[PDB]
Amino acid sequence: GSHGTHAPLIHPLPHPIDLLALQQHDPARFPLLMESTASQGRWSLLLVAQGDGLRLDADGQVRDQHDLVQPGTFLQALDRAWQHERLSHDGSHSLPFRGGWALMLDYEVASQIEPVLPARARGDGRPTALALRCPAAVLHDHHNEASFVIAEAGEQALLDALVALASAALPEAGQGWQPPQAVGEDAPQRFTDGVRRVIEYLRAGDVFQVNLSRRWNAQFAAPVSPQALYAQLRRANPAPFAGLFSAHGRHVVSSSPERLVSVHAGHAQTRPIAGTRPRFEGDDERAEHVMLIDLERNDLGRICLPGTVVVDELMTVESYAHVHHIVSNVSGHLRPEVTPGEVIAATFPGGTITGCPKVRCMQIISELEQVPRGAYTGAFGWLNRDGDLDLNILIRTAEVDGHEVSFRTGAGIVVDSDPDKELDETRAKARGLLRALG
Ligand SMILES: [Mg+2]
Numbered sequence: 407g408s409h410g411t412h413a414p415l416i417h418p419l420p421h422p423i424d425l426l427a428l429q430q431h432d433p434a435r436f437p438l439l440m441e442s443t444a445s446q447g448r449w450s451l452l453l454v455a456q457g458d459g460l461r462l463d464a465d466g467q468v469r470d471q472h473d474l475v476q477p478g479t480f481l482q483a484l485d486r487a488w489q490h491e492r493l494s495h496d497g498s499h500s501l502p503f504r505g506g507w508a509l510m511l512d513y514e515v516a517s518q519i520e521p522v523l524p525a526r527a528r529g530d531g532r533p534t535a536l537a538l539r540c541p542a543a544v545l546h547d548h549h550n551e552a553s554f555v556i557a558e559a560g561e562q563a564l565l566d567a568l569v570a571l572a573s574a575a576l577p578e579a580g581q582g583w584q585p586p587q588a589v590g591e592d593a594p595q596r597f598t599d600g601v602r603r604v605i606e607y608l609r610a611g612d613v614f615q616v617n618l619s620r621r622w623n624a625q626f627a628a629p630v631s632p633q634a635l636y637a638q639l640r641r642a643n644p645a646p647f648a649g650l651f652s653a654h655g656r657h658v659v660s661s662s663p664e665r666l667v668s669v670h671a672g673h674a675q676t677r678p679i680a681g682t683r684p685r686f687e688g689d690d691e692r693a694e695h696v697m698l699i700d701l702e703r704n705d706l707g708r709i710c711l712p713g714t715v716v717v718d719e720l721m722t723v724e725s726y727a728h729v730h731h732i733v734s735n736v737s738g739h740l741r742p743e744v745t746p747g748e749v750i751a752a753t754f755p756g757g758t759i760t761g762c763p764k765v766r767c768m769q770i771i772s773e774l775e776q777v778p779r780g781a782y783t784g785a786f787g788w789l790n791r792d793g794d795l796d797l798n799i800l801i802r803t804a805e806v807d808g809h810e811v812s813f814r815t816g817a818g819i820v821v822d823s824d825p826d827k828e829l830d831e832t833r834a835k836a837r838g839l840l841r842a843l844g
Contacts, residue, residue: 409494411496412493412496412558412559413496413498413559414501414504414505414556414557414558414559415555415556415557415558415559415561415562415565416501416554416555416556417554417555417556417565417569418552418553418554419544419552419553419554419555419569419572419573420573421551421553421573422546422551422552422553423544423546423553423572423573423576424576424578424579425439425450425451425452425544425546426439426579426580426633426636426637426650427576427577427578427579427633428452428544428572428579429452429579429633429650429652430577430579430580430631430633431575431577431579433632433652433653434455434653435454435455436452436453436454436455436544437453437455437508437536437538437540437651437652437653438452438453438508438510438538438540438649438650438651438652438653438786438788439451439452439453439636439649439650439651440452440453440647440648440649440787440788441640441647441648441649442502442646442647443646443647444549446547446549447548447549448548448549448646449545449546449547449548449549450545450546450548451502451503451543451544451545451546452543452544452545453503453508453538453540453542453543453788454540454541454542454543454544454557454564454568455508455538455539455540455653456539456540456541456542456564457471457539458470458471458538458539459471459487459507459536459537459538459539460476460480460483460484460487460536460537461533461535461536461537461654462479462480462515462518462533462534462535462536463533463534464527464528464531464532464533464534465527466525466527468480468483479518480511480515480518480534480535480537481515481518481519481747481748481750481751482747483537484507484509484537484746484747484750484789485745485746485747485748487507487537487539488506488507488745488746488747488789488791488793489745491506491791492791492792492793493790493791493792494792495671495672495792495793495794496792497671499670499671499794501545501556502794502796503543503556503788503790503796504556504558504790504791504792504794505540505541505542505543505556505557505558505561505790505791506539506540506541506788506789506790506791506792507537507538507539507540507788507789508536508537508538508540508651508653508786508788509535509536509537509538509785509786509787509788509789509797510535510536510651510653510656510658510781510784510785510786511534511535511750511754511784511785511786511797512528512534512535512778512779512780512781512784513755513778513779513780513781513782513783513784514526514527514528514534514778514779514780514784515534515535515750515754515784516754516755516768519750519751519754520765520768522765522769523765523768523769523772524772526777526778527778528778528780529777529778530655530807532654532655532656533654533656536653536654536656537789538653540788541557541558541561541564542555542556542557542558542561542564542565542568543555543556543557544556544568544572553572555568555569555572558791579633579634579637580631580633580634580636580637580638581634581637582631582634583631583634583635583637583638584626584627584628585626585843585844586624586625586626586811586843587625587626587627588624588625589622589623589624589625589840590622590623590624590625591620591621591622591623591836592620592621594620594829596620596776597618597620597825597828597829597832598825598826598828598829600618600774600775601618601817601819601823601825601828601829602825603770603774604616604618604770604774604819604823605819605821605823605825607770608819608820608821608823609821612766613761613762613763613766613767613770614698614723614730614732614761614762614763614820614821615686615721615723615732615761615762615767615818615819615820616760616761616767616770616771616818616819617758617759617760617761617767617771617783617816617817617818617819618771618774618775618816618817618819618828619771619775619779619782619783619814619815619816619817619832620775620814620815620816620832621777621812621813621814622812622813622814622815622836622839622840623810623811623812623813624810624811624812624840624843625809625810626809626810626811627809628809629808629809630806630808630809630810630811632650632652632657632659632806633650635659635804635806635811636648636650636659638842638843639659639661639804639839639842640661641842642838642841642842643661643662643802643838643842645661645662645802646679647662647663647679647798648660648661648662648663649663649786649787649798651786655807656781656805657805657806657807658781658784658786658800658803658804658805659803659804659805659806660786660798660800660802660803661802661803661804661839662801662802662803663798663799663800663801663802663803664678664679664680664756664758664798664799664801665677665678665679665796665797665798665799666753666754666755666756666785666787666797666798666799667706667749667750667753667754667795667796667797668795668796668797669740669746669749669793669794669795669796670794671794672739672740672742672744672793673737673738673739673740674706674709674710674737674738674739674740674749675736675737676706676735676736676737676753676756677718677736677737683718683719683720683721683722683758684721684722684758684818685721685722685724686721686722686723686724686818686820687723687724687725687820687822688724688725688819688820688821688822688823688824689822689823689824689827690725690726690822693724693727693728693729694727694728694729695728695729695730695731696728696729696730696731697730697731697733698730698731698732698733698762699717699732699733699734700732700734700762700763700764702763703734703735703757703763703764704751704752704764704765705734705735705752705753705757706735706736706737706738706749706752706753707735707738708752709738709740709741709744709748709749709752710735710738710739710740710741711738711739711740711741714738714739715735715737715738716735716736716737716738717733717734717735717736718733718734718736719731719732719733720732720733720734720736720757720758720762721757721758721762721818723820723821724820725820725821725822725823726821726822732762734757745793746789746793746795749795750797753797754785754797755768755783755784755785755799756783756799758818759783759799759801759816760783761818779814780805780812780814781800781803781805782800782801782803782813782814782816783799783800783801783814783816784799784800785797785798785799785800786798786800802835802838802839804839811843813836813839815832815833815835815836815839816832816835817829817831817832817835
């Protein structure tokens with residue numbers, strides 16, 4: 407009666423390897439790189455693709471590697487592909503990724519989740535979202551010099567070919583960085599008028615906080631290298647977590663992410679990896695303290711077992727003479743047949759970079775920003791065959807397209823916000839990135 411286990415193959419490697427270089431070498435083979443700090447020190451992970459997967463295309467349809475239209479939304483198709491290769495959980499997590507899919511989702515996935523929101527294709531016509539079958543990974547402990555290949559049981563060949571083609575060169579990545587030759591941004595009036603319009607909704611009492619953003623761009627003389635950009639940004643800000651996703655012409659460099667959702671053996675968690683929820687204040691003696699709970703919020707609470715959900719402070723808003731403590735469900739145990747798409751649907755996009763209440767804030771964001779957010783406040787990361795998943799919210803994140811780098815920054819508007827100050831805060835957030843582009 408004892409359950410068959412499916413431990414992943416794990417081969418220790420000759421010597422430390424350069425994952426960035428390795429990706430730069432064969433981007434097609436290595437669609438996603440992620441860096442982390444254990445509670446140890448630094449490490450990295452590079453996912454190895456095998457060539458199947460799914461994409462949500464600009465015509466609003468999902469397709470696979472054979473360009474066949476899969477019916478439904480990206481998250482339905484993703485759920486069918488996961489069921490098809492689903493594994494049962496073996497209860498061990500030394501190793502956080504064990505094979506399954508690299509995921510990248512733009513913010514605009516949200517209109518498939520809440521179809522009240524107008525759908526938007528990417529301007530460049532590339533895929534809004536991707537799920538890439540990845541049956542192996544390369545890991546690199548920074549603390550201990552150790553590198554490994556890991557692959558799903560039954561992938562001995564692929565594992566072999568990777569042990570081959572690691573320790574084979576190391577041309578050495580992310581060199582030839584050229585600073586940009588022009589820099590640009592949305593006309594500032596668009597933002598400050600957006601803020602004034604946000605403040606009408608806040609004064610009406612229908613929303614309590616809204617993350618309003620604006621787009622920045624940098625133009626270069628020669629085509630940009632995603633890994634060279636990545637290296638610039640990591641040097642300039644060595645944040646604990648980061649990554650780089652690249653495939654299908656999407657090139658998404660993340661320099662300061664937050665956790666969107668983590669699931670380990672059905673235990674789902676949304677708490678900031680930082681450890682501390684965000685505080686939002688405007689530009690205004692004993693403050694009032696009101697706890698606010700959105701009773702219709704669609705979140706982990708809808709997909710978890712009763713008696714397991716933990717509630718905690720999502721964010722605070724502090725204006726005039728009050729502090730509102732915005733509380734939501736932050737972790738729980740999933741019902742046993744909850745699918746990865748349903749966890750994504752319950753959690754995406756995060757509440758602190760849209761607003762509260764979430765859906766109404768997304769409609770205001772959509773009307774005021776007028777263009778897709780792309781990777782900004784989207785997510786990427788991975789899904790294991792056993793359903794474990796790790797997705798990050800993309801906050802300090804740039805996209806590369808040929809000679810152009812773009813990125814958005816935003817400010818959490820609250821009822822006593824000052825429009826020109828919020829504008830300054832968006833520029834203060836862009837400064838760090840623009841510095842590093844130098
Ligand atoms: Mg104040």
